[PDB]
């Protein structure tokens, strides 16, 4: 029914910028879609208390508009969900993007029509769009992982998942249980502890966590940032992780024990997860001894913060210090509160939930009014895998990604022509907005090139896609241990630009 140049799926950072680029810069008629009733993406969905960025406020945003960077403000060194949502809502209205989005609208299929070199895209309300290009900015919020504890139906109190937090809902003065201690669960717990009648935490795997050091800013302090913003973004885009600190090249074991502690202590006092992992020493992710030095420093902090050694034993992180580091606003301190109990479910599993609360295998009823699930989601490619997406010859995305999801360059995959991914598989591990910008700017250039020239279809070769996996795999082999590209933002940007400069190396082009 509707003939458009381009379709964008999602209205988070990625979809917002994709619609801007395609509409404003390339002059294409572009429609965006989100199941959400408004823009924001993950910042629209996740409204739990204590929801906070792990990227400093001044860097958790777009950098493409130099005037916008002068204009935005923020209250603290890290940024909260309502502030981010407001920022993204403001971007949408600043660039008049709203009239291009269809909200409350799920894309249920995207089928390639081989004969016409078009994508046929349908919504859950039956609307059909024919488009030359599809840009998928669908994020990771797939189906909500909402675990199957026996007797859950019987609970007479409120059951809440953090990705569907009730707007009014304050749990002040209530008896609350939280299941899950990832970034989200830690954040909810710290938020809840001081206001809740009682808090019971069901801990399965304690994680490494460092202080975030979220502090109020002055208007003079924002003024300093803003006067140097160009240099700041120049540095970020020339770094590996783009978080606003100088990345260390210092081997942890090349200095004395006393200096190593001082270095760790400084980062601990300053705050920041990536700063702790990458700002202290150059080999925490690559050297077993370096990782142990970091890991055991955090363990010692846990033991020092938590008074009761039985409580401390349950919360004690173990093993390698890896993946996205967690940071917190006083998470370990919380367990020193008289009205907070930790339950280590590996050794004392949940037997059932009843009307009144949770019974553990010890046979003790933990009486609760409220049960919070901070249990995350199931999958990461989940959002691709639940849409009927069909490429060339009717090849389904699930048949194509028979094993793990793959991409060429993080943005495209073979047999799916003119179909792009923002933050697809095998892409950078990074402060995300500047990587998102990198990918959308590259997607847009590639679509510009296709439109300028005669291009009917562009897709990666199977061999390019395989060499990219091999490339990612060889970077990942160096590290300690989903497959990301781990060469960093600066390296990723050079790779993307060179692919473009080399006449789209690794793409099959139908002229």
Ligand X SMILES: Cc1cc2nc3c(=O)[nH]c(=O)nc-3n(C[C@H](O)[C@H](O)[C@H](O)COP(=O)(O)OP(=O)(O)OC[C@H]3O[C@@H](n4cnc5c(N)ncnc54)[C@H](O)[C@@H]3O)c2cc1C
Ligand Y SMILES: NC(=O)c1ccc[n+]([C@@H]2O[C@H](COP(=O)([O-])OP(=O)(O)OC[C@H]3O[C@@H](n4cnc5c(N)ncnc54)[C@H](OP(=O)(O)O)[C@@H]3O)[C@@H](O)[C@H]2O)c1
What is the radius of gyration, based on Cα positions, of the chain? 24
Q: Cβ(289)–Cβ(226) under 8 Å?
A: no
Q: Which is nearer to ligand Y, 72 or 181 (CB)?
A: 181
Of 38-46, 343-351, 393-401, 489-497, the window that binds ligand X (rule: CB under 6 A) is 38-46
Task: In angstroms, give the least distance from the CB of 430 to ligand X.
Answer: 7
Q: Cβ(440)–Cβ(420) under 8 Å?
A: no
For 423, the token pair is: 């933050």
Q: What are residue 326's DSSP bridge partners?
A: 209
In whole angstroms, what separates CA 339 from the centre of its chain? 32
Q: Which of ligand X, ligand Y, none is residue 30 near (CB under 5 to 8 Å by kind)?
A: none
**Start-end of H helices in 195-315:** 219-227, 229-237, 257-270, 273-274, 288-305, 309-315
Please report whether residue 157 would count as binding ligand X according to CB under 6 A: no
Please report whether residue 324 would count as binding ligand Y according to CB under 6 A: yes
Q: According to CB under 6 A, which one of 248, 291, 375, 406 is a site residue for ligand Y?
A: 375
> Whole-angstrom Cα distance, residue 357 to residue 351?
11
Size of interface with ligand X, in residues (CB under 6 A):
34
Q: Which is nearer to ligand Y, 179 or 489 (CB)?
A: 179
> Whole-angstrom Cα distance, residue 76 to residue 200?
29
Please report whether residue 199 would count as binding ligand X according to CB under 6 A: no
The DSSP symbol for 394 reads G
Task: In angstroms, give the least distance from the CB of 342 to ligand X.
Answer: 22
Please report whether residue 182 would count as binding ligand Y according to CB under 6 A: yes
Q: Which is nearer to ligand Y, 179 or 436 (CB)?
A: 179
Angstrom CA distances, 184 to 137, 157, 203, 206, stand at 22, 22, 13, 13
Please report whether residue 489 would count as binding ligand X according to CB under 6 A: no
Q: Sheet holding 350-353: strands in order across?
A: 350-353, 357-360, 365-367
Name which of 392, 507, 500 is nearest 448 in CA terms: 500
Q: Which is nearer to ligand Y, 196 or 374 (CB)?
A: 374
Instruction: Assign 3-state DSSP to the chain and report helix, strand, coil percentages, each to 5.
Output: 35, 20, 40
Q: Which of ligand Y, ligand X, none is residue 181 near (CB under 5 to 8 Å by kind)?
A: ligand Y
Q: According to CB under 6 A, which one of 19, 135, 179, 196 is a site residue for ligand Y?
A: 179
Please report whether residue 181 would count as binding ligand X according to CB under 6 A: no
Q: Which is nearer to ligand Y, 184 or 438 (CB)?
A: 184
Task: In angstroms, give the least distance from the CB of 34 to ligand Y.
Answer: 18
Please report whether residue 33 would count as binding ligand X according to CB under 6 A: yes
Please report whether residue 241 would count as binding ligand X according to CB under 6 A: no
Interacting residues toward ligand Y by CB under 6 A: 54, 147, 162, 179-185, 204-205, 324, 374-377
């Amino acid at each position: 029914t509707h003939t458009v140049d381009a379709v964008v799926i999602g209205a988070g950072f990625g979809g917002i910028y994709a619609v801007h680029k395609l509409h404003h810069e390339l002059g294409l008629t572009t429609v965006g879609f989100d199941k959400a009733d408004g823009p924001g993406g993950t910042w629209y969905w996740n409204r739990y208390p204590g929801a906070l960025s792990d990227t400093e406020s001044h860097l958790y945003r777009f950098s493409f508009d130099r005037d916008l960077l002068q204009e935005s403000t923020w209250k603290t060194t890290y940024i909260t969900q309502p502030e981010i949502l407001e920022y993204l809502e403001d971007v949408v209205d600043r660039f008049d993007l709203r009239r291009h989005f269809k909200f409350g609208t799920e894309v249920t299929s995207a089928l390639y029509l081989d004969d016409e070199n078009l994508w046929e895209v349908t919504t859950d309300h039956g609307e059909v769009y024919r488009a030359k290009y599809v840009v998928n900015a669908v994020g990771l919020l797939s189906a909500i992982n909402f675990p199957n504890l026996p007797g859950l139906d019987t609970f007479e109190g409120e059951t809440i998942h953090t990705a569907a937090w009730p707007e009014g809902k304050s749990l002040a003065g209530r008896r609350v249980g939280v299941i899950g201690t990832g970034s989200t669960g830690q954040q909810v717990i710290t938020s809840l502890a001081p206001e809740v009648e009682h808090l019971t935490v069901f801990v399965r795997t304690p994680q490494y966590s460092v202080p975030v050091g979220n502090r109020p800013v002055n208007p003079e302090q924002i003024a300093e940032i803003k006067a140097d913003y160009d240099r700041i973004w120049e540095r970020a885009k020339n770094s590996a992780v783009a978080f606003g600190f100088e990345e260390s090249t210092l081997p942890a074991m090349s200095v004395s024990e006393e200096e190593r502690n001082r270095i760790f202590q400084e980062a601990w006092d300053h705050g920041g997860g990536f700063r702790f992992m990458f700002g202290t020493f150059g080999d925490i992710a690559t050297d077993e001894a370096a990782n142990e030095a970091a890991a055991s420093f955090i363990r010692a902090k846990v033991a020092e913060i938590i008074e009761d050694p039985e409580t401390a034993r349950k919360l004690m992180p173990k093993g390698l210090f890896a993946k996205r580091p967690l940071c917190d606003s006083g998470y370990y301190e919380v367990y020193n509160r008289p009205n907070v109990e930790a339950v280590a479910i590996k050794e004392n599993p949940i037997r059932e939930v009843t009307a009144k609360g949770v019974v553990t295998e010890d046979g003790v009823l933990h009486e609760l009014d409220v049960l919070v699930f901070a249990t995350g989601f199931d999958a990461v490619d989940g959002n691709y895998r639940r849409i009927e997406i069909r490429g060339r010859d009717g090849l389904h995305i699930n048949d194509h990604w028979d094993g793990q999801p793959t991409s060429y360059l993080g943005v495209s995959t073979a047999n799916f022509p003119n179909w792009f991914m923002v933050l697809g598989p095998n892409g950078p591990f990074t402060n995300l907005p500047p990587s998102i910008e990198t990918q959308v700017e590259w997607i847009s250039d590639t679509i510009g090139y296709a439109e300028r020239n005669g291009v009917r279809a562009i897709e990666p070769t199977p061999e390019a896609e395989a060499e990219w996996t091999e490339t990612c795999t060889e970077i990942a082999n160096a590290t300690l241990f989903v497959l990301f590209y781990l060469g960093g933002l600066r390296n990723y940007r050079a790779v993307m630009a060179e692919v473009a400069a080399d006449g789209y190396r690794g793409f099959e082009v139908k002229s």
